[PDB]
Amino acid sequence: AKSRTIGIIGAPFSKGQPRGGVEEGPTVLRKAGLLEKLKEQECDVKDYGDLPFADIPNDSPFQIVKNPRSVGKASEQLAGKVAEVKKNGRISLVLGGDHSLAIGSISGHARVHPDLGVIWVDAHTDINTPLTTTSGNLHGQPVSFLLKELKGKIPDVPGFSWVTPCISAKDIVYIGLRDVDPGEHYILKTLGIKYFSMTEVDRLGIGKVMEETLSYLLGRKKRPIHLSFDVDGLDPSFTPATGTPVVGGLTYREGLYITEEIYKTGLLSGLDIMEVNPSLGKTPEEVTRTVNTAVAITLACFGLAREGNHKPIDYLN
Amino acid sequence: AKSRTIGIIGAPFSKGQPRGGVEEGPTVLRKAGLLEKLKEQECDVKDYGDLPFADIPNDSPFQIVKNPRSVGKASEQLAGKVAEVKKNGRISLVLGGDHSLAIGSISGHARVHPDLGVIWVDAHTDINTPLTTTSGNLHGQPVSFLLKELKGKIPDVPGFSWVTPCISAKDIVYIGLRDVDPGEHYILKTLGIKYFSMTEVDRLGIGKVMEETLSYLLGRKKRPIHLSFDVDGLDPSFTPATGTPVVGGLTYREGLYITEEIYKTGLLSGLDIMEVNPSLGKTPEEVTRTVNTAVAITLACFGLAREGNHKPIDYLN
Amino acid sequence: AKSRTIGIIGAPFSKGQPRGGVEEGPTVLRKAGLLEKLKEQECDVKDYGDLPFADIPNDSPFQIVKNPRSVGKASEQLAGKVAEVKKNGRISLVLGGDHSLAIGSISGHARVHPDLGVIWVDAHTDINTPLTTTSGNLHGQPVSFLLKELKGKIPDVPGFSWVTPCISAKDIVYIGLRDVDPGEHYILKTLGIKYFSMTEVDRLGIGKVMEETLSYLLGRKKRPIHLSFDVDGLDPSFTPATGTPVVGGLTYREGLYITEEIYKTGLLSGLDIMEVNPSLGKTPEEVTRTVNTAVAITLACFGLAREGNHKPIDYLN
């Protein structure tokens, strides 16, 4: 089945943020048996291996923006790989790595399917421009480079001349927001992007949120869905091993409900599992817990339903 | 009050599954002072004691099904006792013990009240047949023996010839499902059984789940209700000392909500508190936490309300 | 802005309950940086300091009621200070201290705003009279001293002659109840007080809870809102360092949603943050967690929102 045909890309990249270890995410996710688990779920899985992100020594800051050439080239090379997987008729599964990789993942996906819609599960908007950013960390800026309405607000950052904005503000839905910068909130409200912060999830419940999200994106016509899952979107009681955790997050159940509903459209076309950092656990158990939650979210994107699953055979004979 | 008139039955049995300690469930529920708290809630409590389960020598397996004569006899004896409690105009309250005992608890209850409706709160469907099971543990098979629609699909298993299917596929509602086998999922679909998996609970909220459950069972007219409560239906964050824990379960709140709602109909007629295993706690507090929750669940079935409770007197004098 | 103009009053009082340490509540809330966080949030903050509560020796009990003269005096002192802050046109922010201080906090606030509506966030109703109490602890009795309907059911308690009931049964809404005494349950129902116990929060979701609360209080016309927050309204997993914790409480998210919805009315006029006991944390981490949660709650009352916030300027320039 189309919704269960997968091309796994390993993106071991960390220079979009300051904390070492996030590049180990593709290794830890594989070691937890992700590939084997997806095949037990009737998936056709092709593992495209881990992208080599050859060292870019001499990568001085652009103003306050850190490692711009490394971040730009990693995303540029990932875009090429995602385009190749999409051309092979497979759902691209990007194992991160930090969230700056979404620049390349979404650009590469939009090359084959320009009509795609984006569902962004995260505690943060990641919509800072290189000029509104106060941290200078590119993992909090991927969306700004991707939105068409922000063209003229993105300065000429070394390593990003290949970037052409591919998503319009009306083609993205945020879910799980709870730590937004002032500049980011200004962008969000001015561009009129559809969002469901933890306030909306509390108000409406996850059922109504997904109902509104899928109607908002697919109501006019059926189009490919790109899900970008930052593991910090869930509460740190489920994914503690991550760079920028924020309390009061989406529950484990809620994370599975979003992925269960997205799978059911049959239109998932690209998936990012980002920000798993196996060296940010306070104990060896916080690491396994983060990785198992990430694996569980992934399996639900490819058909695993809590109600159960069965093959078209007579189980009573 | 009929809704507060109880017949206590201890069922210290574990051979429906391979993990030792669940036979100690009645003792630890009793030690926590369940009977005293119920009497303190204005309940008429009669204690029928803990049933003696004689060891069956040479209890050879039926195919891969383990301890068939023991599970069969334990349920046969429990059926007789539940029928005796019901005939005395009391609500039977079975303290388990593994979930295989539900065969006898529900059969016994259907002998006095054949128009009963079953609410099954669990992470599991326990609807495997002796042939669909892959584990061979009978606690994952009680619903198959009880269902009228499965007559002809259950072979002659030693110890079960006394069983006559007493409930139809339309007289049972599941709440909490999140770990269902393919064959169980097939049965669920082909027999059109009403169920609220954790997916439906996330979608609708426990308020709507309970509205629909009671409307489904009581819609036509009032009829007796049997609640079979497996503690693993709740999240292992609340009930960890259990044999088959599954993450992302019902909350402590949702569990009380379900039981407070069933109490309010005044139609509770049979109750099972199952799968409490006090040898399966990682810490002594994990055991007390499980037992405290199971006691809190039982107290709400018999009137204890979070908004409060009071005697029909004038407290301002 | 008026909704951001604050008058801070520290109330280091503990004699309303038997557990030492709650008098250290205003200090640990200050040491966390509450005032500084409010100032950074564009809040006009004025520190009125901590009230000097003079030790009353030979404070003999009134029947069973412990420290009557000390509790009455402290609330009498707080009433004059809250009334002063209100006449200065600032929102009174009382840093508790045990919940008996609500006597003084609400009374002083009604002296300047007699048409005020109360939102009481608590696991408990705190509506016992000096005659219905079984503990004799005055922190579980403040609502009885304040209701006009209970005038004649409150005996002459030494230190409380200054009290004059300032609210009617229809001017108060409870949210989060789950441990109500029989005497209190009788009072709650006979007076027909509006309440949302955890059962209604589970049934409706916090979104409908806030919809109904605000509609009931502000329906007829706009009126000042007094929020008295007992940190034990939230589950012990978010606020463990407290004297009377009850399991199955409001989540961190619900706590934030209540306080965000209250800010949005622009009618917040009084705020009590009560029962933070830094000496009751099982570990130093349990203390910090409670204090951090209490700070998060307070900031949301004055405009800090999870979707983000921004100043009225063009951030894209």
Ligand SMILES: N[C@@]1(C(=O)O)C[C@]2(CCCN2)C[C@@H]1CCC[B-](O)(O)O
């Ligand atoms: N908006 C921030 C930024 O640096 O631009 C500011 C920040 C630092 C303190 C407050 N939150 C992290 C966030 C970046 C998140 C990236 B990610 O984890 O979602 O991928």
Ligand SMILES: N[C@@]1(C(=O)O)C[C@]2(CCCN2)C[C@@H]1CCC[B-](O)(O)O
């Ligand atoms: N379907 C199972 C079986 O053994 O038949 C397979 C199982 C083991 C691995 C997956 N779940 C346990 C379950 C049984 C639960 C019984 B009870 O705890 O809910 O009462």
Ligand SMILES: N[C@@]1(C(=O)O)C[C@]2(CCCN2)C[C@@H]1CCC[B-](O)(O)O
């Ligand atoms: N109803 C009680 C009372 O003492 O009047 C009985 C009590 C003692 C054990 C059961 N709950 C505490 C509660 C008081 C709460 C005060 B507060 O924390 O909400 O402010």
Ligand SMILES: [Mn+2]
């Ligand atoms: Mn992100």
Ligand SMILES: [Mn+2]
């Ligand atoms: Mn993030």
Ligand SMILES: [Mn+2]
């Ligand atoms: Mn079971």
Ligand SMILES: [Mn+2]
């Ligand atoms: Mn179970």
Ligand SMILES: [Mn+2]
């Ligand atoms: Mn209180």
Ligand SMILES: [Mn+2]
């Ligand atoms: Mn309280």
